[PDB]
Structure formats: structure tokens, C-alpha cells
Amino acid sequence: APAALNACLASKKVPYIPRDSAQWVKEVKPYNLRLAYTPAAIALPTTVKHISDAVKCGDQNKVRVSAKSGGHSYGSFGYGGENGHLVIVVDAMDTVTLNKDMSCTVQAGARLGHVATDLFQFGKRAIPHGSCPGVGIAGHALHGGYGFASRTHGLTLDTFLGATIVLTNGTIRYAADWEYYDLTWALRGAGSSFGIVAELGFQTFAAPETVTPFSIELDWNENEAVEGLLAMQKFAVTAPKELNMQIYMGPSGQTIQGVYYGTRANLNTALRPLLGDLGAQISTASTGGWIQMLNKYANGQALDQRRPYDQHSTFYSTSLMTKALTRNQVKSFARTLFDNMNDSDARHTWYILIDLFGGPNSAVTNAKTLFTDLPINSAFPHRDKLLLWQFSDHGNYATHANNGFTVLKRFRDSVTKTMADGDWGMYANYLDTQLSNEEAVKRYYGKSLPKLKKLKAELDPKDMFWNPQGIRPAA
Ligand SMILES: *Cc1cc2c(nc3c(=O)[nH]c(=O)nc-3n2C[C@H](O)[C@H](O)[C@H](O)COP(=O)(O)OP(=O)(O)OC[C@H]2O[C@@H](n3cnc4c(N)ncnc43)[C@H](O)[C@@H]2O)c(*)c1C
Ligand SMILES: *[C@@H]1O[C@H](CO)[C@@H](O[C@@H]2O[C@H](CO)[C@@H](O[C@@H]3O[C@H](CO)[C@@H](O)[C@H](O)[C@@H]3O)[C@H](O)[C@H]2NC(C)=O)[C@H](O)[C@H]1NC(C)=O
């Protein structure tokens, strides 16, 4: 069957990786080493036509098919979340092209750092995206794309124009608001479930020349954390849009860190109200170029990431997309966390990232259709949320994997217990792997689910493009 496929692929001269070869062992290695899988075949296209033929060779052999770009799926859904998929690795298609009207064409395999590197050097242009340079553009944008430029310039999908996409029947479409309003609407948030994208289009913004990263180091106690976090909610509503912030919380201390697109002295005035509530001061702050800021937050990884790519970790993570927590909700989180922090025996191999996500001064909250003053056509449901939580654990998962799952869930639940069941969601790019399809799609996609399920039945009724937390077609 792996050879039933592999033969079809080479009948259409779709480049494929030979089974159980040296390259097959290097390509089947997931990013998250905790979850590995074994394709039925791996395709390695370099043209849109390869993808189309590869998708047709998938329909022929009744295999589910799944696309992998960067491979940073927290559950290795690039491979399909299971064995026996045809896996179309678009990593080799990474050409960036900057047009004169400031739109760009980015092939579906480009990694974020290769996108910023080529956009700043082809002109001085950029799109908003996350901090990790090795992340693939396809998975990042089709589900959101948040980083230290988002509060100022929006999610990556907010700048999304359209994409050449291969539907389950092999037909190649260019999807944009005019020609395919609903398909493009699904691609802005949940496009992993609807086709194999080969090229994405975005409207770039001018890479700023004056950018100030900053950190504020802290060591809260439980009650200094109920106050400090409540003070940050208020600041998330009022701070200028030039300001981008998150707070790392770990087992031994905290660090408020972010980026202000402006001068140091202006950052000082923006932070004054929050630092007053906190009783804290900037620890490190420096002004420099835009590529400098992306390198400072790349976590040691060189920006211009390309193929071949061999980064790996073994971890479990989850997220939250909350509104402003109440006093008592922040107290439940800090009681449960410092309960863990002060316990010498408990699992301490975790950390938490709380981005300031929405509010009146965030560009995500009222993102618009490009070149318009009308709302954006996007299935992404969380523009009304204020805070983007991420819970991670990078400890042991061979022998004590269920301790890793318990501790992050105990943290996440401590936040949501008192919250109205439909006032909080979760973030698909930070997908919680332990979730039932019903729960996951409820939380990632919210009130877009029915329209998404209606559209899934239109386009992929046999559910070829399958993954554990994918959109299921309506019966
Ligand atoms: C590993 C990692 C992930 C990060 C990091 N930093 C982030 C940040 O600062 N902000 C964020 O908002 N997210 C951050 N993420 C998470 C990434 O955004 C997500 O993990 C991306 O979804 C991963 O994308 P990619 O690198 O392409 O991973 P894949 O496993 O290849 O794909 C995931 C998902 O997308 C589908 N898909 C991929 N390629 C296609 C194409 N061409 N067409 C359709 N669908 C595609 C896959 O099927 C799968 O469902 C920091 C780090 C270190
Ligand atoms: C592969 O599948 C896609 C999606 O299932 C097919 O595209 C869809 O095709 C229909 C008809 O060709 C398009 O027309 C739509 O339906 C009504 C029917 O009355 C038509 O009058 C309208 O023009 C309306 O647009 C539809 O738009 C189109 N959808 C998409 C997303 O492309 C495609 O035809 C299939 N490929 C092959 C080779 O059959």
C-alpha cells in the first residue's frame, strides 16, 4: 500500500521519499519527539502541480492526506495525527516574492525567519508573525499567527490576501475574498482542514527602523501575583498600540518582556502606569533594527531557516483565549500555581506565557478587510478575547507523561472554573493535544464551527484532509 502509493506518485513524477531509506528516517522524525508517526508515503513537491498530482494519488488509494510545512505542530498533525497518511512536505517550496504594490507571494513551505529575511532585504517589508523562525508559514497563518508585532500590525492572517490551494479532488484554485468568499474565510483560521495550500499572499507593512525590546524581571509571591496580573489586565486595555507585551511565569520567577516600536524614552512613558502598579523597573532595554529584535527573541535560532531542518523538542502544551479575569479568578490561578511552585516534590518543568492579545488598542480586535474600513472576513473567533495564555511543559513523557498532562490542565482549569462556559476559548496554533475533537473545535473555532462544518462537507466530504482535531464534515 505504501508502494501502491509510491508507484502512483512516480507515475505522475511527483517527487517522493523512498520508504525506509535514510532520508525517510530523517523526515519521519517529528518536531515534537513525544508524538511520532509513520506515513504511508511522503511526497516532496517543488511545484503546485506535484501537490495536485500527489493529492490525486491520495484520492486514488483512499488514504487520508496531510500537509506539513514547518512541522511545528504541537501534536505533529503535519503527519496526520496517526499513521497511514500520504504526507505532502511542502518544505522545499519556500520562494518569497515582494511586489511593488507591497503585496507578497510566499510559497507554502517558507519558514517565518526566511520570510522576514527575504522581505526586509527585497525591500524593507515585513508581515506580523511569531517569534520562532523555524515555524512554517502555512500552519502559522492558516490558524492565526501571533507575535511581538501583532498588537500593532495584527495576526498574520489579518494581512492574508489569498492562496493558491489544491482541493481534495486535485483541482487547483486561487482563493480570495472576491472569487471564493467562504473558502477564504475558512483559510483565515482553520485552513488546515480544507486543502493543500501551495502559495500564500499577504500585504506587507514597512519594517520599522526604531524598535525597542525590553524585559522586566520580577519575583512575585502569591498575593503580589493576584495584584500584578490584575494590573496587567488594566494596562492591556489602555496601553498604546506601539506596545507589545507578554509575561513569562515559571517555577522560580516571572519576566515581563515585549517590544515597543519606538524610542526608549517613549517606552518609558508607556510603561509608567503599569510599573507604578507593579513597583518594578526595566531590567534590560535596547533600541535597534527590526531584524535585531527578531534575532533577540528567536531563542538562539538563526532567522533564515530553510531546508534541511532538524530542530526537535519533546513537550506538551495547552492554551487559553480568555477575557479579563475577575479578582477571584486571578486568585484561583495564583493559589494553584504557587501551590505547585512552593512544593519541592511537584512537577516544576513548566512555564506560562500570557500575551496581551486584544482590547481597544490592539490591531487584532477590529481587524478589517484589507484596503477597507469593513470587518475582516475570517473564521478566527477570538478577536473579542483579551489574553492569550500558553501553558507548556518540557519534562519527562516516557514514564511520567500523565503527570505532565495533569499539571498543565490543573493550571488551565484554575482559570476557567468560574468563567461562563462560552466566554473563553483556545488557540489552534497552541493546540491542546489531549482534547476531544468536539471540545477542541468548540474552543479553537467557537461560533464559526457550523459554517466550517457546512463548508467542509462542500469541499472535503470524504474527509481526506483529516487530523485528530480537524473540522468534521456535516452529515
Ligand atoms: C514549534 C514552535 C511553534 C510556535 C512558536 N512560536 C509561536 C509564536 O510566537 N506565536 C504563535 O502564534 N505560534 C507559535 N508557534 C506555533 C505555530 O504557529 C504553529 O505550531 C503552526 O501551526 C505550525 O505550523 P508549521 O510550522 O507549518 O507546522 P506543521 O506541522 O507543518 O503544520 C501545522 C498544521 O498546519 C497544516 N499545514 C501545514 N502546511 C500546510 C499546507 N501547505 N496546506 C495546508 N495545511 C497545512 C498541517 O496539516 C497542520 O494541521 C515557536 C515554536 C518553536
Ligand atoms: C473540485 O471540488 C470543488 C469544490 O467541491 C469544485 O468547485 C465547485 O464547483 C462548482 C460547480 O463547478 C462551483 O459552482 C458553484 O455551484 C453553483 C451550482 O449552481 C454554481 O452555479 C455557482 O457558480 C457556484 O459558484 C463552485 O463555486 C466550486 N467551488 C469551489 C470552492 O471551487 C470543483 O468543480 C471540483 N473539481 C472538478 C474537476 O470537478
Numbering used by the authors: 31 to 505
Task: Copy the relevant paper text.
Here, we report phylogenetic analyses, combined with the selection and characterisation of five fungal AA7s, three of which belong to previously unexplored clades. We determined the crystal structures of FgChi7B and FgCelDH7C at resolutions of 2.4 and 1.6 Å, respectively. Both enzymes share the canonical AA7 fold comprising an FAD-binding F domain and a substrate-binding S domain that is formed by a central β-sheet flanked by α-helices.
The selected fungal sequences share 25–39% amino acid sequence identity and originate from Aspergillus nidulans (AnAA7A, clade I), Fusarium graminearum (FgCelDH7C, clade IIa and FgChi7B, clade Va), Magnaporthe oryzae (MoChi7A, clade Vb) and Polyporus brumalis (PbChi7A, clade VI). The KM values of MoChi7A and PbChi7A towards GlcNAc were about 20-fold lower compared to FgChi7B, highlighting a marked difference in affinity for monosaccharides between these enzymes. All previously characterised AA7 oxidases are distinguished by a cysteinyl and histidyl bi-covalently tethered FAD cofactor.
